[model samples]
Target: TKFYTDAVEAVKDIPNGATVLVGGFGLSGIPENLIGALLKTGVKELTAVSNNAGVDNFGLGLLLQSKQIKRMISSYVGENAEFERQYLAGELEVELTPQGTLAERIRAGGAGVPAFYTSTGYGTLVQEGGSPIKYNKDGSIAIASKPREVREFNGQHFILEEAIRGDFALVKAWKADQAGNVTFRKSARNFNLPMCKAAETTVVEVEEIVDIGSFAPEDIHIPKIYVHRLVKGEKYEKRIERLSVRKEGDNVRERIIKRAALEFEDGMYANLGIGIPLLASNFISPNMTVHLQSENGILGLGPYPLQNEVDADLINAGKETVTVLPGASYFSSDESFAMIRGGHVNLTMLGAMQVSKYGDLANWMIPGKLVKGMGGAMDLVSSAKTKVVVTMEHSAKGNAHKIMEKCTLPLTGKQCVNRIITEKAVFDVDRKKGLTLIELWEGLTVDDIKKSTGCDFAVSPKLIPMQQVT
Candidate 1:
């Protein structure tokens, strides 16, 4: 009952305005065949749920370029400029959700849970929903979302979010049996497994098809009961979003990364954010048991492989290839954030643009810029049980310090940042007092810092100056 030889036959029935949950973490495990077929169907006004709209001229970006997707429910969209243009021009409806919440919504729908509560966006525009969703051609609000209900439990606040049930789901997998049991390799399993069941109809395109008894029961990631149709995929680009190396320029980047690794504790459960924090994996000692958590849903992360060891299937939250350690565990975005929202993570290091003296953080979006929606930042900082450190340059290229009196941009989380690390200094936030300058580069003076900084701060009573390693 699950056999389909043609992608066109599988997707031609998708009507306008249908919600589609697509599988992929970037180009990996994307249903290119089905997506290509969908494009040919001339579908219009469809809504898409994905981690990010794929980069321009590829994946979902093809649909976006055709103006076929009128609404997007996603966690991030920075890779595509067309997405930015459409959103800013008011031609699209954007429901920017935290990546974890987005995954859980799909998972919940499949699990048949109507709704649930999460503390991720407690005080942000996400809960209040004042952020513009769409504007009229005449420049007025064409559509704006209503605020979410907030409830308190055990001294913490959580906002309610509904489950996501799609009309149809398109997914890609490495292999599938004729009976529709699917196998997804590495991080590609992220959204593919859950979305296959959450939709009333699911179409799967796979690189390899096997006989029904060929798969060991344990190797199957998605059971046959969840899959509706199957199509053999022709070609897959399987692109790496970005390739990264340990070296860039001066030793400053490495020094900052090494110092940030100092925050790692033994046996800690840690989640590293993008930017310099991601490099902490390079400095993490092999002897320590601090498990690295990738926001896209991997734990027990190891250092990035050498050039020859790169694997398209092995990737982290940043969409860069990585190696997983022996005890590594893979789960859905729902389970990963459940660990985060439940206060299980011990430490988190994040990249930030501006951090106010009171620990207010603004990282995800910059006003008037092509912004990536808050993926897991809001949840990790707001809910992690332990310390949160923000890593950034002390000053922008134009000499404006990133440490500010208050963030002028949208806030990621209020009073959630505990420490700030930069090439020039390290400061701790104390809401009762102001920022306490805890560590400063040996070559820099207080006057030098004052010249670069925009905010007022106090030196810690135990202030110490460390040698500039570079």
Candidate 2:
């Protein structure tokens, strides 16, 4: 029979200093009860492996606040305030990995494909100190040093990367059998399947537990052989990180629709890179066609369909209801990557952590912190023909400039950004040279801009600035 124990009971066997792997993308598919149980166990110095460090008050964020985790090995550090504080204070140790490579590491560990080569970290901090294997006609030697070319594959460069493994894996599933066979609900399937094999002990929590053979072989995303323990839970409240609201005193949703309406052009293939950018879908003009692509293989995304018209499986990166645009297509990770890598996407609108004056992006890391996995930032940013970063000026702390001179943390893409649109103003970095301020918010002077940012910026010949909406 399947276990009916609470998370606390299920994780009572865990001891201090154990390396634990929690599988999820952001907070989705997180084993809530198991995490809650482990908290009560008071185990300390845990090494956690995940895409991101949970939110500030919940998820992995809670363990971070409790000081239960000693180190984190992951890709993207989430926007958790506490995670940032502890990491910057030297209370936590973080080992950042390339998003795709981290996922592949877990997958390879599970599949016994130890150590693989990738191009994701070739020219970034991710390659720092790692060994590089050379593949060239001349038998040239290459070492994995700060962002150097490792090798060439298919006429493109590749890099050397190693696989990762963990001691205990804690995961969440939408549904599971008493024997631990599991299924994930759509995009929540991000990293759970691979972490099962990457860890020595795998614990799973599910919303529903069924009898053996209840799930069809085709529907089982993860087989029972990978699961060692199981628990059942109810209710999951996944929070959105950045909630966008329209200018006060204006019709919020309507304004969003209008802005979106203006941005969509006919026949342009687009990928709405999560958060407010997803709202762009609500404004596509009729008869002016466009194909929406998601990293998960869904193409031709349309507006939300009414009841009875909804396909429970069809959703976007945010896991929201979506309509399949005409002649849409579906693919696996490999095929989906081919589209992105081949630059089939005409435009990609993405959120950002920080945009440097040189147009370099540091959206993936926070120097030293627990972070979410960088799902596809490197792939999209480095390869997309035209990339636009949409975000607000400063953090909620009322800091004036969202633009900086140099990135303090690891970069998502170096000098790959084209244009940036913030709520306060729109700016473009100089393509050829230094930080050139092209525009500012109306009523704001260059003096004010300088006061806001700690770095020095030069005024561009084209400066049409705007002011913050009062």
The candidate that achieves the highest lDDT relative to the unseen native structure: 1
Q: Alpha-carbon error at 271 in model 2, in Å? A: 2.5
In terms of lDDT, model 2 sits at 0.64
For every model shown, the clashing-pair count is: 0, 20
Please list the Cα RMSD from the true structure of every candidate, rounded to 1 decimal place. 2.9, 9.1
lDDT of 1 by residue, 320-390 (tens): 88878888987766777787877788888899989988888888876455356888888887773658898
| Runs in model 2 lying further than 4 Å from the true structure | 1-6, 128-149, 234-269, 274-283, 288-346, 351-375, 384-410, 414-470
In the range 371-420, model 2's lDDT, one tens digit per residue, is: 44456776666553555454434433666455677666566676666665
